[PDB]
Amino acid sequence: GFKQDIATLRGDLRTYAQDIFLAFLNKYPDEKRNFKNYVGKSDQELKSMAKFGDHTEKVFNLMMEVADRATDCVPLASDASTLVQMKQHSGLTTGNFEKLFVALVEYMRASGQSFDSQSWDRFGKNLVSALSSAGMK
Numbered sequence: 001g002f003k004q005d006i007a008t009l010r011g012d013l014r015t016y017a018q019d020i021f022l023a024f025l026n027k028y029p030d031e032k033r034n035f036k037n038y039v040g041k042s043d044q045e046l047k048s049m050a051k052f053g054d055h056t057e058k059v060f061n062l063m064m065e066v067a068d069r070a071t072d073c074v075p076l077a078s079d080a081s082t083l084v085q086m087k088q089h090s091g092l093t094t095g096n097f098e099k100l101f102v103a104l105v106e107y108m109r110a111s112g113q114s115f116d117s118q119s120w121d122r123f124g125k126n127l128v129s130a131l132s133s134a135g136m137k
């Protein structure tokens with residue numbers, strides 16, 4: 001289930017983080033409005049860019065802690081508040097997060113592994129709800 005999936009992702013997190021983020025950028029190319037340094041680069045070129053690997057790992061590091069602190073795929077209000085109030089998230093809306101979770105769920109469904117894709121879909125929907133409640137537009 002969901003908790004085992006956090007363990008699975010954490011066991012190879014740099015790789016899963018980059019492949020999920022690439023699945024997001026490739027599914028939703030207009031999302032690069034917020035990542036202008038990633039325009040005009042293939043996946044292998046992005047993996048070679050220091051901030052692509054180091055920021056994407058740090059994003060998934062924190063996402064796995066928010067997932068781990070959740071109860072039944074519902075994040076802590078303190079985690080939602082932190083994600084709204086981060087200066088690096090000043091430009092964002094809940095739709096940016098919805099699209100990331102649609103890509104993460106599609107990636108899990110396409111894998112041969114017994115990921116609990118239904119739980120990740122609920123987590124993404126519950127995180128969006130919590131971000132809205134904490135004041136993200």
Ligand code: HEM
Nearest residue numbers: 031034051054055058059060062063088089092096097100
């Ligand atoms: C649960 C989901 C997310 C978590 C846990 C999270 C966490 C983080 C963290 C920890 C950073 C700091 C990275 C660093 O400076 O090394 C960061 C930066 C940033 N995050 Fe988020 N984030 C999430 C979702 C998103 C989404 C969906 C977007 C946009 C589609 C976004 C846009 C950014 C941007 C633009 C930065 C700064 C630019 C950059 O770091 O390259 N984040 N986030």
Ligand SMILES: Cc1cc(F)ccc1O
Nearest residue numbers: 021052055056057059100
């Ligand atoms: C900055 C960032 C945001 C995400 F949502 C995914 C990967 C990243 O490097």
